[PDB]
Amino acid sequence: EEEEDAGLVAEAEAVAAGWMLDFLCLSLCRAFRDGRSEDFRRTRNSAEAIIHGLSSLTACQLRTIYICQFLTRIAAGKTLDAQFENDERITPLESALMIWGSIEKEHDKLHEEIQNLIKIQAIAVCMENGNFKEAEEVFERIFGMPFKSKLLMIISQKDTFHSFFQHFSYNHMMEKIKSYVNYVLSEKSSTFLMKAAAKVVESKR
Amino acid sequence: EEEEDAGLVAEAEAVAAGWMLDFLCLSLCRAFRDGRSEDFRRTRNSAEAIIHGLSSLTACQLRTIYICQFLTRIAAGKTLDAQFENDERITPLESALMIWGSIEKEHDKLHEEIQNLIKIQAIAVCMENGNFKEAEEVFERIFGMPFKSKLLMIISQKDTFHSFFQHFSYNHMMEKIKSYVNYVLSEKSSTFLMKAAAKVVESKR
Ligand SMILES: CNc1ccccc1S(C)(=O)=O
Numbered sequence: 585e586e587e588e589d590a591g592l593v594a595e596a597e598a599v600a601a602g603w604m605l606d607f608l609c610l611s612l613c614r615a616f617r618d619g620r621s622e623d624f625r626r627t628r629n630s631a632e633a634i635i636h637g638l639s640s641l642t643a644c645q646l647r648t649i650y651i652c653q654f655l656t657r658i659a660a661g662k663t664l665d666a667q668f669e670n671d672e673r674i675t676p677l678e679s680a681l682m683i684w685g686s687i688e689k690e691h692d693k694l695h696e697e698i699q700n701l702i703k704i705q706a707i708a709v710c711m712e713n714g715n716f717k718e719a720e721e722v723f724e725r726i727f728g729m730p731f732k733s734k735l736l737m738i739i740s741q742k743d744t745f746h747s748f749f750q751h752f753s754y755n756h757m758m759e760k761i762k763s764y765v766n767y768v769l770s771e772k773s774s775t776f777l778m779k780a781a782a783k784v785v786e787s788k789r
Numbered sequence: 790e791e792e793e794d795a796g797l798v799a800e801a802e803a804v805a806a807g808w809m810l811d812f813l814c815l816s817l818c819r820a821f822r823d824g825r826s827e828d829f830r831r832t833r834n835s836a837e838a839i840i841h842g843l844s845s846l847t848a849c850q851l852r853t854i855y856i857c858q859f860l861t862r863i864a865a866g867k868t869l870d871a872q873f874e875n876d877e878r879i880t881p882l883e884s885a886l887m888i889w890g891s892i893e894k895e896h897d898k899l900h901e902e903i904q905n906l907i908k909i910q911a912i913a914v915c916m917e918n919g920n921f922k923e924a925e926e927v928f929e930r931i932f933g934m935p936f937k938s939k940l941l942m943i944i945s946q947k948d949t950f951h952s953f954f955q956h957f958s959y960n961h962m963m964e965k966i967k968s969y970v971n972y973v974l975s976e977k978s979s980t981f982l983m984k985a986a987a988k989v990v991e992s993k994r
Pocket residue numbers: 628631632635649652653656657668
């Protein structure tokens with residue numbers, strides 16, 4: 585009876601942790617979309633902690649975790665001292681690109697546009713910090729012809745403020761990513777914890 | 790409409806965070822009661838993070854936070870390098886004693902027994918580490934006559950393994966605290982998130 589009770593309790597804790605992960609993902613998406621930097625930081629810390637208390641993951645929960653990790657790396661895209669992988673050479677935007685290619689999602693036009701904007705900016709952020717040799721190394725790791733050769737020419741000329749980086753800017757990458765985040769927000773707005781909390785708030789109006 | 794929606798969303802996030810705090814407190818109590826050291830550590834990290842995302846606290850939520858903080862200091866009672874207060878001189882058991890005296894709860898016989906056991910052990914843990922001068926300083930900060938004079942005599946004799954510390958031992962303090970934790974477990978087992986999760990598990994049996 586003691587082991588049977590402990591077992592049912594552990595199963596209930598796993599159910600509640602899954603509900604907490606979905607809610608925290610929704611809150612993280614909304615903070616990213618709104619540009620609420622401090623709320624994003626605190627929500628990320630909460631999400632990471634809840635994830636460490638989870639063991640079995642369904643395919644849906646792994647996709648949710650990948651979305652949280654992807655937005656965290658994009659938020660840190662210009663923080664070149666942040667090490668997100670065991671290989672210390674991988675920059676934050678290169679780490680976001682790896683997760684973007686692993687998520688079980690449709691490869692629609694928006695998917696490829698975000699992918700190519702992260703590739704251009706992974707090089708651009710190195711150039712803007714005067715890290716010319718690092719830009720060439722990020723280029724080799726990513727690329728792994730017309731798009732490729734324009735980028736290599738810009739790296740070799742050390743043209744940091746090139747007009748190419750203004751046409752495919754960091755702001756344009758953020759805006760395209762926010763369009764994708766809006767779809768995730770619509771999909772997760774109906775998850776258990778947010779629905780129950782919204783019902784309580786509405787009943788008091 | 791944009792500010793009105795943002796407002797309702799923030800209210801719903803506060804409701805869900807309150808439900809998460811109660812659930813995490815219940816899980817932390819159960820890990821402490823069971824002696825599941827690693828689960829206690831991970832649950833504490835999750836609790837701390839959720840608490841940083843909360844702003845307005847009801848009297849009930851402040852009591853819940855005090856219970857989490859109290860068990861954390863008791864779990865760290867023998868870690869004399871842990872600094873829980875801005876005043877670096879305060880030891881973990883002295884910090885647990887301060888919280889124990891601040892919780893809005895009945896001062897029954899069990900309350901006073903736990904209080905006195907934490908006082909004896911706050912000195913005992915210093916003696917057992919050979920920190921005789923620190924034991925005298927903890928004594929002065931706490932005490933703050935027959936109980937008092939026996940303790941001062943033991944500190945002055947440097948009688949670390951005194952039979953007094955075996956009669957009012959660290960294990961006896963932990964057991965009395967676990968009795969109190971069982972009452973908190975019964976009280977919080979009916980909170981929203983645990984009840985809903987338990988209903989899901991049961992419906993699959
Ligand atoms: C489990 N990882 C996780 C979860 C949520 C947000 C960020 C991360 S991280 C530290 O990998 O960027």
